[PDB]
Design a protein around this ligand. Structure first.
Ligand code: HAS
Ligand code: HEM
Ligand SMILES: CCCCCCCC/C=C\CCCCCCCC(=O)OC[C@H](O)CO
Ligand SMILES: CCCCCCCC/C=C\CCCCCCCC(=O)OC[C@H](O)CO
Ligand SMILES: CCCCCCCC/C=C\CCCCCCCC(=O)OC[C@H](O)CO
Ligand SMILES: CCCCCCCC/C=C\CCCCCCCC(=O)OC[C@H](O)CO
Ligand SMILES: CCCCCCCC/C=C\CCCCCCCC(=O)OC[C@H](O)CO
Ligand SMILES: CCCCCCCC/C=C\CCCCCCCC(=O)OC[C@H](O)CO
Ligand SMILES: CCCCCCCC/C=C\CCCCCCCC(=O)OC[C@H](O)CO
Ligand SMILES: CCCCCCCC/C=C\CCCCCCCC(=O)OC[C@H](O)CO
Ligand SMILES: CCCCCCCC/C=C\CCCCCCCC(=O)OC[C@H](O)CO
Ligand SMILES: CCCCCCCC/C=C\CCCCCCCC(=O)OC[C@H](O)CO
Ligand SMILES: CCCCCCCC/C=C\CCCCCCCC(=O)OC[C@H](O)CO
Ligand SMILES: CCCCCCCC/C=C\CCCCCCCC(=O)OC[C@H](O)CO
Ligand SMILES: CCCCCCCC/C=C\CCCCCCCC(=O)OC[C@H](O)CO
Ligand SMILES: CCCCCCCC/C=C\CCCCCCCC(=O)OC[C@H](O)CO
Ligand SMILES: CCCCCCCC/C=C\CCCCCCCC(=O)OC[C@H](O)CO
Ligand code: CUA
Ligand SMILES: [O-][O-]
Ligand SMILES: [Cu+2]
Lengths: 32, 166, 554
């Protein structure tokens, strides 16, 4: 049917990437 | 079952690979934006500017720390900073707020970092070369310079100061 | 043992592993001390009583870097990416060469160790000029690294011999991994070889007064990035081709695994300027290009995350797990060989997230040279790589020695693996956070105890990780020596097959596998991209060399 577990894993990975990236990018501008 | 699982896995992987590529492309676009704004001044001028680290303290713009701040524009100052073991000259560096500051940093001895706490200024300082970066200080007060490149036993205690006047 | 008469490759592999692990243990001793340092606690006077040759925090940090990140990881790479293709093809490696590779490593290490231990090369594992180490450090490091060239020849040998016996057949999976891996490494290595031969060696020998710091850093990071993948890929070979079996399942796609590896061959070297975002005299347009390519080199691991995840799910579904969480509990959580790499993969999520931030050019000015970097890479190498290596003790050691793993030793393996994992997670929080507070890396901060008051909270995580990791390490030392020096031997374990996974059913893309198999073509492409990504900058730098005198500041 569909690999729901894999998707869940790459979901956590995407969110972690996004929080880290957007987090740092906010920081960059605050210090800009 | 196995045959189906494999088709389903591969099909969703392709979706994921496309999404991941997109996200990465967006970041590329969000970085290109930073390149277009004033915040990019902290990126080093990638132009080579050789100097002699053995005479840099005797002759040239780094020889007299009290004259290291030069007005080079209507609203621009250039600072000739020397990062050395284990300190920075001048100490303090004194610049006006709202003015564009072109830091020209070099080293007499080994490599040092020039990391201005509270700001995006973060540049390796190499002996024999001049590091050029730009920043406009928007808030007045006292900013600490940290050396973030190992430079020997005096590394952890190597600090400097920037005073940004109103 | 007559098993070593028929498979002498086992004995050589063994020697690579043990020397690797010995180097890990010695390097790791400085770790808890460095962790307590970033927790603003000074336990160095204690360390100097136990180890009186240690003159400073920075000598310790040097040994820690060289021994953990250079020596162990290379010895593990040479162990894994020689022996695994050897078993998959069922062929003998050139045994004269394999032994020559070991001695080179051992000799190179000893010679480098001497100045390191005598405080004559406190330069760090990056040894940036003008900090000037003893010639024996550069020479010993060089001979140690060049050992890999002999490894490269070995696998290319095995591969060519197989292709002759088997024309019209595609390269087997593990061998395909190893071939692209070693050819990737050859291109990557040239940066440091050039740096040692042209600059560092003659300079340390007295033959030249100075070295140009910019060119050295530029040549260093030519090798410096792909070396990170050089550490990573051996763990990946296991994660892809062995871990699925250990987990109770199969590898879901052979072609995807090949694609990841092929991407690494292509994209691992032309990216070094991402270690040079804060360097002068390197044009920004070039930094942007490298940044983009670095983001690309993230694709093979994003791909890996899915292929591996799906393989783990498949295994958990086979073992009866239902829903979207149940496949996780269904996995063999009592088996340290399964647990160690899976935990390492977990921590790799924030690890790779921090890498993607670092690669982002301007965003790097935020974290460059702060505690963040160490926080980032302990997730990558000190966790995922190290853990996968620890977990192989439980299958590889018995395959190489015939020595059994008792229930007790297995339970101790679990404890070690968890505590190491959790210690690394805790330290990661402390270092990323402190990094965001502008705490510098490579610093004896505990000796400036009022310098970073804002870091008080992340500092408590650092102390915690320090003590947790010390215990993990002590348990690892005890556990490793308990298996290596165990009395009983059972030669039927040494003659058992490696737990290589099967590939799940379903037609692959034959065309893609064949395309990927055109290895000479991909090697040339890889080489071209390096000429395009480094040629212009390096031509400019070599035209404008400015060598400066060296310093010893320790
Ligand atoms: C072996 C170790 C290494 C890996 C791999 C690694 C990967 C990355 N790095 Fe890095 N890093 C940088 C960027 C990257 C990028 C973009 C990635 C990427 O390749 C990462 C991509 C990975 C992912 C996108 C993660 C995918 C996750 C997976 C595959 C796990 C999934 C979980 C599963 C499947 C399990 C779930 C199962 C269940 C049961 C639930 C840059 C800059 O652009 C710098 C310099 C920063 C500065 O300013 O100095 C840097 C510096 C370092 C240094 C310091 C060098 C020094 O001493 O100065 C080291 C040692 C290091 C190591 C390593 N690095 N890195
Ligand atoms: C018992 C576990 C260990 C602990 C507690 C730990 C602790 C530390 C900390 C706190 C630092 C930063 C020190 C500083 O920036 O001044 C560091 C540096 C380092 N560690 Fe470890 N570490 C451990 C094991 C390992 C392992 C297994 C590796 C990878 C194989 C390793 C690779 C690195 C490298 C490459 C450096 C950077 C050295 C440099 O900047 O010159 N660590 N570690
Ligand atoms: C495994 C370890 C996990 C690592 C922890 C790092 C996680 C996320 C970084 C996100 C960056 C933090 C964002 C906070 C700053 C912010 O929100 O930025 C605006 C503010 O004004 C600025 O001064
Ligand atoms: C800002 C957004 C934050 C939110 C996180 C985003 C979720 C992350 C990844 C999804 C990746 C998987 C993409 C789904 C692909 C669909 C597909 O290919 O499905 C084929 C199937 O045959 C159809 O029936
Ligand atoms: C399927 C849908 C396709 C559409 C998907 C589109 C992706 C949208 C994401 C980001 C937008 C980028 C916005 C760039 C503007 C950045 C401005 C900023 O961040 O400002 C900083 C600061 O205020 C200045 O001084
Ligand atoms: C799990 C991870 C936890 C995440 C926690 C992250 C906390 C740090 C966030 C942002 C730092 C932003 C840096 C900006 C510093 C501003 C301070 C300032 O203004 O100081 C200098 C000024 O000159 C005084 O006069
Ligand atoms: C420096 C001398 C290096 C000494 C190297 C001795 C090589 C011994 C070795 O491991 O080779 C097998 C040899 O044929 C014996 O049995
Ligand atoms: C492994 C290799 C180790 C290096 C040893 C010998 C390499 C040969 C070095 C060639 C001699 C260079 C000396 C030279 O010509 O120096 C330039 C001088 O600075 C201008 O006056
Ligand atoms: C192979 C075995 C020995 C190689 C011989 C290497 C011996 C090189 C000695 C030169 C040396 O130590 O010169 C220091 C110089 O003063 C710079 O600081
Ligand atoms: C393969 C991908 C190739 C595509 C890579 C994109 C490179 C294009 C433009 C870079 C613009 C550089 C501008 C930086 C200068 C800003 C400046 O002068 O900052 C002070
Ligand atoms: C900061 C420090 C906090 C640490 C955060 C890292 C995540 C912690 C553990 C991994 C969770 C993954 C799930 C693994 C649990 C094992 C399991 O499911 O086993 C149950 C039982 O044994 C049936 O076999
Ligand atoms: C396996 C799972 C891996 C995933 C776990 C990784 C956690 C990632 C981010 C944590 C978010 C940190 C919270 C953000 C801090 C923002 C904040 O509070 O900012 C500080 C403030 O601006 C200054 O005063
Ligand atoms: C609440 C605050 C947190 C403070 C952190 C305390 C740190 C370590 C405690 C010991 C952790 C030991 C975990 C062992 C798990 C284990 O070995 O179990 C195998 C498992 O059954 C599947 O593999
Ligand atoms: C896993 C759980 C780990 C640590 C508990 C969190 C510890 C955070 C407590 C901070 C204590 C501290 O150092 O206090 C802050 C500052 O000193 C005020 O005066
Ligand atoms: C078995 C489970 C136990 C797991 C422990 C739970 C984690 C929390 C705290 C312990 C951390 C130990 C750190 C104590 C060091 C004190 C310190 O350095 O704090 C100084 C203070 O904040 C400024 O003066
Ligand atoms: C295996 C993992 C074991 C995990 C256990 C964590 C360590 C114990 C924590 C309990 C709290 C003990 C508090 C002791 C006092 C701390 C203190 O006061 O700090 C010492 C001093 O200030 C510095 O020089
Ligand atoms: C030098 C080796 C780099 C080239 C590797 C490709 C190659 O030689 O491919 C043909 C092979 O020898 C026959 O199967
Ligand atoms: Cu100057 Cu560290
Ligand atoms: O560099 O990862
Ligand atoms: Cu890199």
């Amino acid at each position: 049917e569909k690999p729901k577990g894999a998707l869940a894993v790459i979901l956590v990975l995407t969110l972690t990437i996004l929080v880290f990236w957007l987090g740092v990018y906010a920081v960059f501008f605050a210090r800009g | 079952d196995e045959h189906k699982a494999h088709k389903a896995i591969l099909a969703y992987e392709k979706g994921w690979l496309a999404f991941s590529l997109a996200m990465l492309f967006v970041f590329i676009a969000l970085i290109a934006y930073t390149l277009a704004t004033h915040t990019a001044g902290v990126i080093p001028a990638g132009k080579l500017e050789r100097v002699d680290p053995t005479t840099v303290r005797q002759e040239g713009p780094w020889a007299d720390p009290a004259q290291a701040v030069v007005q080079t524009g209507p609203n621009q100052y250039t600072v000739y900073v020397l990062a050395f073991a284990f300190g920075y000259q001048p100490n303090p560096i004194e610049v006006p707020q709202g003015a564009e500051i072109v830091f020209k940093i070099t080293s007499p001895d080994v490599i040092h970092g020039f990391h201005v706490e509270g700001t995006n200024i973060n540049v390796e300082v190499l002996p024999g070369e001049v590091s050029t970066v730009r920043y406009t200080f928007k808030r007045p007060g006292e900013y600490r310079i940290i050396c973030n490149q190992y430079c020997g036993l005096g590394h952890q205690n190597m600090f400097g100061t920037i005073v940004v006047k109103e | 043992s007559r098993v070593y008469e028929a498979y002498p490759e086992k004995k050589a592999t063994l020697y690579f592993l043990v020397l690797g692990f010995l180097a890990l243990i010695v390097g790791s001793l400085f770790g808890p001390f460095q962790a307590l340092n970033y927790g603003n606690v000074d336990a160095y006077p204690l360390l100097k009583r136990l180890l009186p040759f240690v003159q400073s925090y920075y000598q310790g940090l040097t040994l820690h870097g060289v021994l953990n990140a250079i020596v162990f990881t290379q010895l593990f790479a040479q162990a894994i990416m020689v022996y695994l293709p050897a078993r998959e093809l069922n062929m003998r490696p050139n045994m004269g060469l394999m032994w020559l590779s070991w001695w080179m490593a051992f000799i190179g290490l000893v010679v480098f160790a001497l100045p390191l231990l005598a405080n004559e090369a406190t330069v760090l594992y990056t040894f940036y000029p003008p900090l000037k180490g003893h010639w024996a450090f550069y020479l010993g490091a060089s001979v140690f690294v060049l050992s890999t060239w002999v490894s490269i020849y070995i696998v290319l040998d095995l591969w060519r011999r197989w292709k002759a016996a088997n024309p019209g057949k595609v390269t087997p999976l593990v061998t395909y991994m190893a071939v692209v891996f070693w050819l990737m490494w050859f291109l990557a290595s040239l940066g440091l070889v050039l740096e040692a031969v042209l600059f560092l060696l003659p300079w340390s020998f007295g033959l030249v007064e100075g070295v140009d710091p910019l060119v050295a850093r530029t040549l260093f990071w030519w090798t410096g990035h792909p070396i990170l993948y050089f550490w990573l890929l051996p763990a990946y070979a296991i994660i892809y081709t062995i871990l699925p079996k250990q987990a109770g399942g199969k590898l879901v796609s052979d072609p995807m695994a090949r694609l990841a590896f092929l991407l690494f061959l292509l994209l691992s070297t032309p990216v070094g300027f991402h270690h040079q975002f804060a360097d002068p005299g390197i044009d920004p347009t070039w930094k942007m290009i490298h940044s983009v390519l670095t983001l690309f080199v993230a694709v093979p691991s994003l791909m890996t995350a899915f292929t591996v995840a799906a393989s783990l799910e498949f295994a958990g579904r086979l073992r009866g797990g239902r829903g979207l969480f149940g496949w996780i509990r269904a996995l063999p959580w009592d088996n340290p060989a399964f647990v160690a790499p899976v935990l390492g993969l977990l921590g790799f999520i924030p690890g790779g997230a921090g890498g993607i931030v670092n690669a982002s050019f301007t965003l790097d000015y935020v974290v460059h040279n702060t505690a963040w970097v160490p926080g980032h890479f302990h997730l990558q190498v000190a966790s995922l790589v190290t853990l996968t290596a620890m977990g192989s003790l439980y299958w590889l050691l018995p395959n190489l020695t015939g020595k059994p793993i008792s229930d007790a030793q297995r339970r101790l393996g679990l404890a070690v693996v968890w505590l190491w994992f959790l210690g690394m997670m805790i330290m990661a929080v402390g270092l990323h956070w402190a990094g965001l507070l502008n705490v510098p890396r490579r610093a004896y901060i505990a000796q400036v105890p009022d310098a970073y008051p804002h870091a008080a909270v992340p500092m408590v995580f650092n102390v915690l990780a320090g003590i947790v990791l010390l215990v993990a390490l002590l348990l690892f030392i005890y556990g490793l020596f308990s298996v290596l020096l165990s009395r009983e031997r059972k030669p039927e374990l040494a003659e058992a097959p490696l737990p290589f996974a099967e590939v799940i059913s379903g037609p692959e893309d034959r065309r893609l596998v064949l395309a990927m198999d055109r290895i000479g073509f991909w090697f040339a492409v890889a080489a071209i991209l390096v000429v395009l990504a480094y040629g212009p900058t390096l031509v400019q730098l070599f035209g404008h060399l400015n060598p400066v005198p060296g310093w010893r500041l320790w």
